[PDB]
Design a protein around this motif. Structure first.
Motif, PDB file in Angstrom:
ATOM      1  N   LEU A  43       0.781  -1.239   0.000  1.00 57.35           N
ATOM      2  CA  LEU A  43       0.000   0.000   0.000  1.00 57.35           C
ATOM      3  C   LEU A  43       0.819   1.299   0.000  1.00 57.35           C
ATOM      4  CD1 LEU A  43      -2.537  -1.030   2.788  1.00 57.35           C
ATOM      5  CD2 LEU A  43      -2.867  -1.277   0.327  1.00 57.35           C
ATOM      6  N   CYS A  44       0.356   2.290  -0.773  1.00 57.04           N
ATOM      7  CA  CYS A  44       0.977   3.622  -0.850  1.00 57.04           C
ATOM      8  C   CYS A  44      -0.157   4.554  -0.424  1.00 57.04           C
ATOM      9  CB  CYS A  44       1.453   3.929  -2.275  1.00 57.04           C
ATOM     10  SG  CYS A  44       2.740   2.784  -2.898  1.00 57.04           S
ATOM     11  N   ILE A  45      -0.003   5.169   0.745  1.00 61.50           N
ATOM     12  CA  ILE A  45      -1.073   5.971   1.319  1.00 61.50           C
ATOM     13  C   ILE A  45      -0.924   7.469   1.541  1.00 61.50           C
ATOM     14  CG2 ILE A  45      -2.761   5.978   3.188  1.00 61.50           C
ATOM     15  CD1 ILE A  45      -1.497   3.004   3.745  1.00 61.50           C
ATOM     16  N   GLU A  46      -2.022   8.178   1.287  1.00 59.43           N
ATOM     17  CA  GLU A  46      -2.126   9.622   1.482  1.00 59.43           C
ATOM     18  C   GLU A  46      -3.134   9.707   2.622  1.00 59.43           C
ATOM     19  OE1 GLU A  46      -0.589  12.090  -0.002  1.00 59.43           O
ATOM     20  OE2 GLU A  46      -1.871  13.877   0.096  1.00 59.43           O
ATOM     21  N   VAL A  47      -2.784  10.419   3.690  1.00 59.75           N
ATOM     22  CA  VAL A  47      -3.650  10.520   4.858  1.00 59.75           C
ATOM     23  C   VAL A  47      -4.358  11.859   5.009  1.00 59.75           C
ATOM     24  CG1 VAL A  47      -3.782  10.223   7.351  1.00 59.75           C
ATOM     25  CG2 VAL A  47      -2.082   8.963   6.055  1.00 59.75           C
ATOM     26  N   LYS A  48      -5.650  11.783   5.316  1.00 59.30           N
ATOM     27  CA  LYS A  48      -6.489  12.962   5.515  1.00 59.30           C
ATOM     28  C   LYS A  48      -7.415  12.739   6.708  1.00 59.30           C
ATOM     29  CE  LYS A  48      -5.244  15.470   1.893  1.00 59.30           C
ATOM     30  NZ  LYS A  48      -4.008  15.263   1.083  1.00 59.30           N
ATOM     31  N   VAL A  49      -7.961  13.826   7.236  1.00 56.67           N
ATOM     32  CA  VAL A  49      -8.866  13.762   8.376  1.00 56.67           C
ATOM     33  C   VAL A  49      -9.869  14.904   8.268  1.00 56.67           C
ATOM     34  CG1 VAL A  49      -7.521  12.546  10.108  1.00 56.67           C
ATOM     35  CG2 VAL A  49      -6.962  14.897   9.539  1.00 56.67           C
ATOM     36  N   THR A  50     -11.145  14.603   8.482  1.00 55.15           N
ATOM     37  CA  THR A  50     -12.174  15.629   8.374  1.00 55.15           C
ATOM     38  C   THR A  50     -13.327  15.434   9.358  1.00 55.15           C
ATOM     39  OG1 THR A  50     -13.650  16.763   6.803  1.00 55.15           O
ATOM     40  CG2 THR A  50     -13.473  14.362   6.632  1.00 55.15           C
ATOM     41  N   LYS A  51     -14.041  16.520   9.632  1.00 58.32           N
ATOM     42  CA  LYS A  51     -15.175  16.478  10.542  1.00 58.32           C
ATOM     43  C   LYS A  51     -16.495  16.354   9.774  1.00 58.32           C
ATOM     44  CE  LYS A  51     -13.919  20.398  12.550  1.00 58.32           C
ATOM     45  NZ  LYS A  51     -12.527  20.623  12.067  1.00 58.32           N
ATOM     46  N   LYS A  52     -16.468  16.698   8.490  1.00 58.83           N
ATOM     47  CA  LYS A  52     -17.657  16.631   7.646  1.00 58.83           C
ATOM     48  C   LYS A  52     -17.913  15.201   7.193  1.00 58.83           C
ATOM     49  CE  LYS A  52     -16.617  21.257   5.800  1.00 58.83           C
ATOM     50  NZ  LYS A  52     -16.480  22.072   4.559  1.00 58.83           N
ATOM     51  N   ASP A  53     -18.926  15.009   6.352  1.00 59.34           N
ATOM     52  CA  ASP A  53     -19.248  13.679   5.847  1.00 59.34           C
ATOM     53  C   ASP A  53     -18.830  13.554   4.380  1.00 59.34           C
ATOM     54  OD1 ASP A  53     -21.442  15.413   4.945  1.00 59.34           O
ATOM     55  OD2 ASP A  53     -22.362  13.535   4.264  1.00 59.34           O
ATOM     56  N   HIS A  54     -18.035  14.516   3.927  1.00 58.72           N
ATOM     57  CA  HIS A  54     -17.527  14.535   2.560  1.00 58.72           C
ATOM     58  C   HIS A  54     -16.221  15.317   2.564  1.00 58.72           C
ATOM     59  CE1 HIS A  54     -19.357  18.498   2.909  1.00 58.72           C
ATOM     60  NE2 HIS A  54     -18.715  18.874   1.818  1.00 58.72           N
ATOM     61  N   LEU A  55     -15.345  15.018   1.611  1.00 56.57           N
ATOM     62  CA  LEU A  55     -14.073  15.713   1.535  1.00 56.57           C
ATOM     63  C   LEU A  55     -13.615  15.912   0.098  1.00 56.57           C
ATOM     64  CD1 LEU A  55     -11.577  16.834   3.112  1.00 56.57           C
ATOM     65  CD2 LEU A  55     -10.630  14.522   2.919  1.00 56.57           C
ATOM     66  N   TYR A  56     -13.033  17.074  -0.165  1.00 55.61           N
ATOM     67  CA  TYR A  56     -12.524  17.394  -1.490  1.00 55.61           C
ATOM     68  C   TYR A  56     -11.003  17.301  -1.459  1.00 55.61           C
ATOM     69  CZ  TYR A  56     -11.943  19.791  -5.956  1.00 55.61           C
ATOM     70  OH  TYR A  56     -11.647  20.108  -7.257  1.00 55.61           O
ATOM     71  N   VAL A  57     -10.420  16.612  -2.434  1.00 57.84           N
ATOM     72  CA  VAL A  57      -8.969  16.475  -2.501  1.00 57.84           C
ATOM     73  C   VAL A  57      -8.480  16.951  -3.867  1.00 57.84           C
ATOM     74  CG1 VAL A  57      -7.026  14.878  -2.366  1.00 57.84           C
ATOM     75  CG2 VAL A  57      -9.022  14.550  -0.891  1.00 57.84           C
ATOM     76  N   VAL A  80      -9.109   8.280   4.735  1.00 55.59           N
ATOM     77  CA  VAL A  80      -9.790   9.413   5.339  1.00 55.59           C
ATOM     78  C   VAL A  80     -10.434   9.065   6.670  1.00 55.59           C
ATOM     79  CG1 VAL A  80     -11.484  11.238   4.997  1.00 55.59           C
ATOM     80  CG2 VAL A  80     -10.239  10.324   3.044  1.00 55.59           C
ATOM     81  N   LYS A  81     -10.092   9.850   7.683  1.00 56.16           N
ATOM     82  CA  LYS A  81     -10.633   9.666   9.017  1.00 56.16           C
ATOM     83  C   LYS A  81     -11.802  10.625   9.202  1.00 56.16           C
ATOM     84  CE  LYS A  81      -9.291  10.181  13.923  1.00 56.16           C
ATOM     85  NZ  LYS A  81      -8.221  10.710  14.831  1.00 56.16           N
ATOM     86  N   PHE A  82     -13.012  10.156   8.917  1.00 58.89           N
ATOM     87  CA  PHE A  82     -14.177  11.003   9.105  1.00 58.89           C
ATOM     88  C   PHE A  82     -14.434  10.962  10.606  1.00 58.89           C
ATOM     89  CE2 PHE A  82     -15.416  11.075   4.594  1.00 58.89           C
ATOM     90  CZ  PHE A  82     -14.786   9.930   4.114  1.00 58.89           C
ATOM     91  N   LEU A  83     -14.217  12.090  11.274  1.00 59.52           N
ATOM     92  CA  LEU A  83     -14.388  12.180  12.719  1.00 59.52           C
ATOM     93  C   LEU A  83     -15.789  11.883  13.230  1.00 59.52           C
ATOM     94  CD1 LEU A  83     -12.208  15.312  13.502  1.00 59.52           C
ATOM     95  CD2 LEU A  83     -11.619  12.900  13.796  1.00 59.52           C
ATOM     96  N   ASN A  84     -16.299  10.704  12.898  1.00 63.91           N
ATOM     97  CA  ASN A  84     -17.618  10.294  13.346  1.00 63.91           C
ATOM     98  C   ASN A  84     -17.898   8.860  12.922  1.00 63.91           C
ATOM     99  OD1 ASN A  84     -20.759  10.220  13.416  1.00 63.91           O
ATOM    100  ND2 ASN A  84     -20.224  12.166  14.402  1.00 63.91           N
ATOM    101  N   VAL A  85     -17.606   8.541  11.665  1.00 68.60           N
ATOM    102  CA  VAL A  85     -17.824   7.189  11.160  1.00 68.60           C
ATOM    103  C   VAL A  85     -16.576   6.312  11.306  1.00 68.60           C
ATOM    104  CG1 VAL A  85     -17.238   7.938   8.832  1.00 68.60           C
ATOM    105  CG2 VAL A  85     -18.439   5.788   9.159  1.00 68.60           C
ATOM    106  N   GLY A  86     -15.403   6.904  11.105  1.00 63.26           N
ATOM    107  CA  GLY A  86     -14.172   6.145  11.223  1.00 63.26           C
ATOM    108  C   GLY A  86     -13.353   6.144   9.948  1.00 63.26           C
TER     109      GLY A  86
END
Lengths: 114, 114
Positions: A43-57, A80-86
């Motif tokens: 795996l080659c990974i790009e890490v992101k984290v958000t509080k919303k239920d959608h994210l723009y990259v 993506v770590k959606f701060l609610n669902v996981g």
């Protein structure tokens, strides 16, 4: 070195290691955030984290991930770590025009088995 | 937080890229220094630099290298930049734990690869 999202990255590295993967975090910021491997899957990974239920990259970032993963021999993954669902894992494709996602776009760490 | 020989590491990264490899440098210093891949071969590398014509490599580093490479699923490699002579490489076997490395006991980048 050490991106502003350094804490999130560390957490992921632990999850992956917890599942039998060896992982390294990049010191520079021109490649991908993490590179993992377990002898079978790579795996080659790009890490992101958000509080919303959608994210723009941005295209730039995703294009970079894909080109790198392709040459390396690993799966291009956006974590993506959606701060609610996981944590949700999305394998991105160069066919994609706009990189915007929701959890249903990805799968769980386990599901990402293979 | 930055390691000695970071300059040599950047230098080796370019060399590898010239041969078709995608490569990242590790932020932490507890794994391996570099991790590379080209779509069919995967390398986990330990980078060293010396002004002498020989270098003793310890049990601790090699054990760390071999173990991480085994889990990741890559070839464990020791890379040493001997000033005034160049880079030398050797795929380390899990049956060796310590040794003195010389430019002739190792191979060129081309041979390690092809």
């Amino acid at each position: 070195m050490y991106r502003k999202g350094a804490q999130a990255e560390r957490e992921l590295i632990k999850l992956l290691e917890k599942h039998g993967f060896a992982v390294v975090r990049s010191a520079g910021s021109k490649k991908v955030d993490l590179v993992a491997g377990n002898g079978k899957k790579y795996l080659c990974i790009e890490v992101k984290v958000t509080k919303k239920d959608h994210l723009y990259v941005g295209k730039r970032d995703m294009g970079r991930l894909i080109e790198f993963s392709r040459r390396f021999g690993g799966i291009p993954v956006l974590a993506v770590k959606f701060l609610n669902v996981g944590w949700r894992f999305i394998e991105v494709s160069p066919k994609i025009e706009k990189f915007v996602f929701t959890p249903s776009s990805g799968v769980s760490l386990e599901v990402l088995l293979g």
